Amino acid sequence: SGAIYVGNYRVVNRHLATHNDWANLVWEDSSRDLLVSSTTAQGCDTIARCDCQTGVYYCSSRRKHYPVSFSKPSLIFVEASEYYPARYQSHLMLAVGHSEPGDCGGILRCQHGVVGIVSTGGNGLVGFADVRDLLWLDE
Ligand SMILES: NC(=O)[C@]12CN(C(=O)Cc3ccccc3Cl)C[C@H](C1)C2
Ligand SMILES: [Zn+2]
Numbered sequence: 001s002g003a004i005y006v007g008n009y010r011v012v013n014r015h016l017a018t019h020n021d022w023a024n025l026v027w028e029d030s031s032r033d034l035l036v037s038s039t040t041a042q043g044c045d046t047i048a049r050c051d052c053q054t055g056v057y058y059c060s061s062r063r064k065h066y067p068v069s070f071s072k073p074s075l076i077f078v079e080a081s082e083y084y085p086a087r088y089q090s091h092l093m094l095a096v097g098h099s100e101p102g103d104c105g106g107i108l109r110c111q112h113g114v115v116g117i118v119s120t121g122g123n124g125l126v127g128f129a130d131v132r133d134l135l136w137l138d139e
Helices: 019-023
Strands: 006-011 024-031 032-043 054-059 065-068 073-076 087-096 108-112 115-122 124-131
Touching: 006 115, 019 024, 019 032, 054 115, 054 124, 065 087, 087 115
Parallel strands: none
Antiparallel strands: 006 032, 024 032, 054 065, 054 108, 073 087, 087 124, 108 115, 115 124
16 A cells, blocks of 8 residues: 655555545556545655656565665556456566565655655566656646
């Protein structure tokens, strides 16, 4: 679990979104595993606007933060799950690091702010759904 709160927006993994999120839906993309909903309260997370390939992510299955080198956002095949059939997830960044299903929603940050959230993993790898291209989150 986990979310990004910037201005009047809440960014979550689309597979973990609540009824409130869908009843206050701004944007959603199943190929990205992202859902953005409107909030009443003002959010303060700064989103990074960069091409960083190093950062730190929160791993709730270890209750620790981890420094990672990660790939550039791309189309990466994701094995069929209960939430989605077998498909290529877009805007996904991989890194060598620990992850477990309850880890989805873990924030990845660089020096410029929020890069993205944990969305995939397994076999000693962790995937992050990128949010730096979503320029409308600040306007
Ligand atoms: N992005 C997806 O299609 C999902 C991918 N998901 C996993 O990769 C689950 C997972 C397995 C082992 C280690 C880590 C993780 Cl996160 C779970 C949910 C469907 C999100
Ligand atoms: Zn950066």
